[PDB]
Design a protein around this ligand. Structure first.
Ligand SMILES: Nc1ncnc2c1ncn2[C@@H]1O[C@H](COP(=O)(O)OP(=O)(O)O)[C@@H](O)[C@H]1O
Length: 412
DNA sequence: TGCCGAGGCCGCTCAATTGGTCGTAGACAGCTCTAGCACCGCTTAAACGCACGTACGCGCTGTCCCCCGCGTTTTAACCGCCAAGGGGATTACTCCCTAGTCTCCAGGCACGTGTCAGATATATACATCCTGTGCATGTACTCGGGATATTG
């Protein structure tokens, strides 16, 4: 039976939890598309004690017009396909986050910040995100990095130079990232235009067509439960669906999702039987052709990037296949990935598949551990004055960050 | 009996359709126009469409309560028929008049340009006309009783 989600927690703090040693403790801000995750670096403690503000990245303002609201509670959100592209709907998302974390007082946030961004970020987008940050909030110095690569940095066996493929899958994108000597080989990195949002959207539209008698009973927040709790990824889809074909297996494995009641009441207050549907929603990232979409999918793409290298460095970078982010949470994901990988390697060769320690939070914990180390490496950060000579389309090439290129944007 | 008378099958000859072959004449497809002026691309400052609670108007709804429907059959002539008669619609011919062709011939006017005006649009101020509302009676109605008209 379905549950309902929680809302409106009580995060309130003093003006700044400044510890011993250096006073400018940075904010660690994972600016996610599904949800934002934000908090103080809190140095000198091994386990990250409190990743506060776990909240959905969505805002309310309706037919009333005169007000808007920002916490977990018609709706809007600041992103287009995992790049932020909104003005004040970004501000009132930052404002919520700062106010609930506490801030000093004066006409700026006194603390430096580390902020996640898109695997590639359009130059205009980076420029705007820098302007909307330095101008309005007055931050002293800033760092941009990629969610996935922070999660890798967290999960590495050692704080040392590495190579691998990162497999990442968030709200509206999945990416395959080849990395060599700690550097993202962004020349031949690739992404797929699908993700967990689109899975839920498909599972919704399926069950709407299965039970037209009660369109209103099924809605995204209930699709979330069946997709998180009750769905799994096949080892081989055309074989799973084949064992699902016989009634004696079906009845033993179909999921009985009881709606809340007011004929045994199921003619409207149905038990929403999900069978094959609990496979067809996860599978979208491996076979986007279950939707209309003609793209290679996470299987053909991995082969298509992996055959663009010399045969020795393939055998190097496949030694660390890493799973992180959103959709990798499905049960069975490691097994499907390592089976699909076994067919596309030399007959006796070796590979290894690692799953992130906490697939959803390790991006933030990574950004924490990174900033807490690189406090004083002033070649890594963008300082407030640099933004006055370099127009905002500028970045500092540390590991776990997008590849910079010399370029400039006309503005007046 | 008879005879034959009446009787039942098969090549000429003509008269539409049908399809074929002859040759020749504009009219169709196409080219090059060429030429130019519309389509487009490129900006601009622009109007008007459109996605979106809430007051709330009325579309739809649960009751009882009766005529007109619903059912029958007698009959009543309506409608159908067939057969006969008369002509008038029809057919086939001969004489006849003009429909149609072409050709010459003119100027009527429909065509076209050449200028630029009285026209009507658009704004601002505005007063006024017109709508929506609220509000008495006056009639057009439904009924009952009797006179006149008309059917059988
Ligand atoms: N436990 C889970 N099982 C399955 N899917 C999950 C789970 N938790 C989150 N997701 C999916 O993860 C996606 C969001 O992941 P996230 O890393 O926050 O995205 P991003 O970094 O792009 O904002 C959502 O589409 C959601 O459906």
């Amino acid at each position: 039976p379905f549950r309902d989600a929680r809302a409106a927690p009580d995060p309130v703090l003093e003006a700044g939890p400044v510890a011993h040693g250096p006073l400018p403790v940075p904010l660690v801000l994972d600016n996610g598309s599904f949800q934002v995750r934000a908090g103080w670096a809190c140095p000198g403690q091994d386990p990250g004690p409190e990743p506060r503000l776990q909240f959905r990245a969505v805002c309310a303002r309706g037919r009333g017009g005169a007000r808007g609201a920002s916490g977990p509670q018609m709706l809007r959100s600041p992103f287009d396909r995992n790049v932020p592209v909104n003005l004040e709907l970004q501000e009132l998302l930052l404002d919520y986050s700062f106010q609930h974390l506490g801030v000093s007082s004066q006409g700026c946030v006194d603390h430096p910040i580390v902020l996640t961004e898109a695997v590639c970020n359009p130059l205009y987008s980076r420029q705007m995100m820098s302007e909307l940050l330095f101008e309005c909030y007055g931050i002293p110095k800033v760092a941009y990095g990629i969610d996935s690569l922070f999660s890798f940095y967290h999960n590495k066996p050692k704080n040392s130079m590495c190579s691998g493929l990162i497999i990442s899958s968030g709200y509206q994108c999945t990416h395959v990232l080849p990395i060599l000597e700690g550097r993202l080989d962004a020349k031949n990195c690739k992404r797929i235009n699908l993700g967990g949002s689109q899975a839920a959207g498909y599972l919704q539209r399926l069950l709407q067509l299965k039970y037209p008698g009660h369109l209103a009973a099924i809605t995204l927040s209930r699709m979330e439960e069946i997709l998180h709790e009750h769905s799994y990824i096949a080892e081989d889809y055309v074989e799973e669906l084949h064992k699902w074909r016989c009634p004696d297996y079906y009845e033993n494995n179909v999921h009985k999702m009881q709606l809340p009641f007011s004929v045994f009441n199921l003619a409207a207050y149905h038990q929403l039987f999900v069978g094959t549907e609990r496979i067809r929603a996860p599978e979208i990232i491996f076979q986007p052709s279950l939707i209309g979409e003609e793209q290679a999918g996470i299987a053909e793409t991995l082969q298509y990037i992996l055959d663009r290298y010399p045969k020795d460095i393939q055998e190097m970078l496949v030694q660390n296949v890493f799973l992180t982010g959103g959709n990798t949470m499905y049960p069975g994901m490691k097994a499907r990935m390592e089976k699909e990988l076994l067919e596309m390697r030399p007959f006796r060769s070796s590979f290894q598949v690692q799953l992130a320690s906490n697939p959803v939070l390790d991006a933030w914990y990574g950004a924490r551990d990174w900033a807490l180390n690189h406090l004083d490496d002033n070649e890594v950060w963008i300082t407030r004055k640099e933004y006055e000579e370099k127009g905002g389309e500028y970045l500092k090439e540390h590991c776990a960050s997008n590849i910079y290129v010399p370029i400039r944007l006309p503005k007046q």
